[PDB]
From a paper:
ParD2 is the antitoxin component of the parDE2 toxin–antitoxin module from Vibrio cholerae and consists of an ordered DNA-binding domain followed by an intrinsically disordered ParE-neutralizing domain. Like the more intensively studied CcdB, ParE poisons gyrase by stabilizing the so-called cleavable complex between gyrase and DNA. This leads to double-strand breaks, activation of the SOS response and ultimately, if the ParE toxin is not counteracted by the antitoxin ParD, cell death. In analogy to ParD from plasmid RK2 and ParD2 from M. tuberculosis, we predicted VcParD2 to be a DNA-binding protein that represses the parDE2 operon.
The VcParD2 sample formed crystals that diffracted to 3.1 Å resolution only after three months. The asymmetric unit contained four dimers of the N-terminal domain of VcParD2 and the corresponding models encompass residues Lys3–Arg51. The N-terminal two and C-terminal 32 residues are not visible in the electron-density map. Dimer formation buries about 1240 Å2 of mainly hydrophobic surface and creates the hydrophobic core of the protein. In the crystal, the VcParD2N dimers are found in a circular arrangement. This results in a torus consisting of eight VcParD22 dimers. The interface formed by adjacent VcParD22 dimers buries roughly 600 Å2. This interface is highly hydrophilic [PISA P(Δi G) value of 0.91] and is dominated by hydrogen bonds and salt bridges, and as such deviates from typical stable oligomerization interfaces. In contrast to SaCopG, VcParD2 does not associate into a helical structure, but forms a closed circle. The dimer–dimer association of VcParD2 is nevertheless very similar to that of SaCopG bound to DNA, suggesting that crystal packing may also reflect associations occurring on the DNA here.
Author numbering:
A (entry chain D), B (entry chain C), C (entry chain F), D (entry chain E), E (entry chain H), F (entry chain G), ...: 3 to 51
Write the structure that this text describes.
Amino acid sequence: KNTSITLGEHFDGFITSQIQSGRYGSASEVIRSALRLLENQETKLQSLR
Amino acid sequence: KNTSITLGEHFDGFITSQIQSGRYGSASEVIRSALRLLENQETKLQSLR
Amino acid sequence: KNTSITLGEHFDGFITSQIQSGRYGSASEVIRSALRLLENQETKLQSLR
Amino acid sequence: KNTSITLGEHFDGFITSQIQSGRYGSASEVIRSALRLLENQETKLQSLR
Amino acid sequence: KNTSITLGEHFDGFITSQIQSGRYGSASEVIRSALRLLENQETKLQSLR
Amino acid sequence: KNTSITLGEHFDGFITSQIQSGRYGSASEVIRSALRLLENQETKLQSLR
Amino acid sequence: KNTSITLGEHFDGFITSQIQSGRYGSASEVIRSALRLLENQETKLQSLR
Amino acid sequence: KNTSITLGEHFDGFITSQIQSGRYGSASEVIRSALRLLENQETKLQSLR
Amino acid sequence: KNTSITLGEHFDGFITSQIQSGRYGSASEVIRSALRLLENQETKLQSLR
Amino acid sequence: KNTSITLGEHFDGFITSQIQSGRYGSASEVIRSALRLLENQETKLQSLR
Amino acid sequence: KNTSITLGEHFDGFITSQIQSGRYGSASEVIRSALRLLENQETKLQSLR
Amino acid sequence: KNTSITLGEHFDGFITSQIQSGRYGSASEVIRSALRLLENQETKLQSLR
Amino acid sequence: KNTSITLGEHFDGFITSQIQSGRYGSASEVIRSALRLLENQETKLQSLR
Amino acid sequence: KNTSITLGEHFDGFITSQIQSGRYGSASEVIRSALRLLENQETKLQSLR
Amino acid sequence: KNTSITLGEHFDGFITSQIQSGRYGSASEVIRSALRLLENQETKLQSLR
Amino acid sequence: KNTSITLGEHFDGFITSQIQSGRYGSASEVIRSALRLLENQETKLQSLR
């Protein structure tokens, strides 16, 4: 719980702009959806080997 | 940069397991790679419309 | 049954524009089709792991 | 904003299960992600016809 | 058999367009082909889960 | 409006069964999703020529 | 319309198998679907040459 | 044997035209090739599930 | 018209076994379908160069 | 061995044109290559069903 | 006309075995079909760049 | 090894042009690569049946 | 731990520009992501064999 | 020139495994191949926007 | 003309075994075919961009 | 060790172009990458028979 992360200005602006578009709610939503993408990709990877 | 966000225990464990495999260095690396994946998806999407 | 959702203005506009095409009937139809897509994605995901 | 939807017991259970997996936060998060999936499908579709 | 279904004006126009091209004979035919597609999808789905 | 169509005694059972799983609403909803699938298959196949 | 065609016993059995499954209604229906496939092939062909 | 089938006034012209190009023999030949195409599409699509 | 061909025993057996399946009618049908396949391959080839 | 086939003028012209391109030697060569193409198609097909 | 080629024993045996199978006539047939394959592959390559 | 075969002017020119591009050394190299392509096709084919 | 590598000036500038794009943090992060891509390509190669 | 970086024990073992296989000469070779792959990815990315 | 290259023992044995397989003539032929594969991979990369 | 081979002026220019781009270090690197590609091809080949 409560993890400290050091992101660049690029991804800060990216998260803010994703919030502005109305497609995402909070920054937690954006990061959790991106991590869902990454976890699904990794699960697809190890499904082979 | 230097922000604290409370993620679920599932995603905390996922990030830790990804770090323990040796592929990723820090949790910042994992979150940056996830954001890169999401940004590339969005770039492939909005390039059409 | 009888759930209250807080959707953004962007997603309300998306649902309305989907209804305007005539392909979908109501907002419930659009949300049900979206949940069907997500459930199919999950059923294809967890089939591996 | 403020939408009252009467989802079936199957979709209520699916939303609750996606919450319990730790991948999704709230029910609104699941519904927004499913709507994002449908929106991306349609954005890939209407780019052709 | 012999069921009353309120299809949207868009889908009514689509069924008429498919009929008047000569490729399909009746509205029952176009609906049966669409249901064949959907049943193939669902049978490929529930075979996994 | 409210078109009467003589479907086979097999697609009737399939529509009802798809309703029973809690994934679809009415028979009109299943028929509409199937017509959407046929329209999307059209748009994807007629994309070449 | 109303043409006499000598189809082989294999294709007669195939048309019957497609009919008695409930997915197709008449032999005209199965032949029309097959001709749709063949016409799509030829239209994609002669569009090139 | 020698089945009588009521095809539309459009597939009639298509069959004749395909005969006129010197690529097919009789109407039975065109119908047989189309049925072969449908059977092969079946064998290729039902290969997954 | 009225051409004499010197086919090997292997190809005579292939044509006969194709006729035995019921998908094709005569040896002329098999040879015509083979020439159609080769002509389609060529028409797709020379479309580039 | 020794097969008398009455090919249409279209296929006679196609065989002669394939001979004139310098890619094929005789008409029997073109017919054997087309039969090889059909045999490979069927060998790829029957491996599934 | 009349070109001298130095092939290994591997491809000599390969050409002879392709003749034995009845799929090819002479060694010229085998080599010309292989060169047709190579020319089609090269034409597909330079179709892009 | 050290065999003379009369190929068509088309294939002679094709081989010469392939040698002039600098990719292939001799005509033996070109014919060996073509035979490798055909042998790999045959290996992928007969591996099934 | 601690490995010395002499990369080209092209890759030096590329790594520095990837750091400057905000998508990557340090040079080690670019190297780790590239090695992840390489390992995933290897794994996808081993998917078939 | 002569830069020192510390990759994880995972990536150290990975580079050593790639060298002991004989495919890659130095660690510089493995890193340059990975950087080529990642540069291909990023260049395909930036071509859209 | 005349270039000196120090390849690994793995690739030395691989080239000698490819020569021994009868598929390739000399070491120069293996090297030229591998460089052809590499150039074709590059060209296929430039197909999109 | 220290083997000398003569590749064509085409392949000489190719290796030089790959070096001047900064992607590949030596000519040994380019040749080793090409040999890796060809070894992947041949290993995927021999896995069948």
